[PDB]
Symmetry: D2
């Protein structure tokens, strides 16, 4: 009927956080997060924070910061300037998730 959709990541922040405000005006910050698994492959994650965690992320995270993150997966549908249909899967960290500077 309904399910579980949970993501946990520990890794290093790719560049400085980009935080912006909606009209509301609630904070949304964006980062990319690198995790690596060795047998080396590194994996880049698009993490987006909302609400209090957005402000905290925006304030405290920097390029190279190590951080723990817990959220859920959302794939957004969007259009390129040729029309078409593109998709991006992100890790949404909001009130139902968590973040910890490490």
């Amino acid at each position: 009927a309904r399910g579980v959709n949970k993501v946990i990541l520990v890794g290093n922040v790719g560049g400085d956080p980009e935080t912006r405000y909606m009209p509301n005006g609630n904070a949304v910050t964006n980062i990319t997060l690198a995790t690596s698994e060795s047998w080396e492959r590194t994996e880049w994650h698009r993490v987006v924070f909302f609400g209090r965690l957005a402000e905290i992320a925006g304030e405290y995270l920097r390029k190279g910061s190590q951080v723990y993150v817990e959220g859920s997966l959302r794939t957004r549908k969007w259009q390129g300037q040729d029309g078409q249909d593109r998709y991006t899967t992100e890790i949404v960290v909001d009130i139902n998730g968590n973040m910890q500077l490490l």
Copy 2:
């Protein structure tokens, strides 16, 4: 050198597609639906490797409820038009887990 973990419980979207590579090894593919009701449903591309692939292929059907634990991998590809596209999947292999529910 990071943590990259995904846990999902949801219902399988269509019958599993399983195929064999050279080497004699199974890879099965499903889509998995998770929903949070106040309703939004989220579709996940899950791909299994190794023993779990055979087990998935054999036991999962359209509508099956299943628990899944894997890690996120986004694959880059050029679409027929010149463009870069990305597909993020949940890889469930020896480091992950699956459990048929019901």
Copy 3:
């Protein structure tokens, strides 16, 4: 830090739910998880729910129900009737956690 527990298993007996003056509900179960490989070892967990999930658990869980549970670990200290220190570690599932009835 982070303190997180995820369990899928079968409920051991009927839930025991009770209400405080407030009221607010608290329900208790035991939950069995097994790893098979001996031929199986089963592990018994003391899970306790608070708030909305407590009512939902109380209502919907029964002996034998399969359920998913996400909470955090709390270990309670107590003196037993021999005067000795005892400890009980529970999985607390509250507003920060989650529960999902499985099957149909």
Copy 4:
């Protein structure tokens, strides 16, 4: 079923590592996680086996921050009987994971 625990916190004292009749290492720590609402800290008994036991023993120290993923095992034991006692531990072995944090 599924029996999974994930913790991030600070190690309570130096790790205690010991070796078994074979050669295999087992190391023990306590791990503190805290939530402020103004604060409650929770102490976890974590026990490592195999490679992670050696890595834990070598690299973890009092105050180290670490990520840990394991499963819950409650052990029965006598000790002094006295009486029989029970202790729930987080077992981190080949099916789990650990990551030293900080840099």
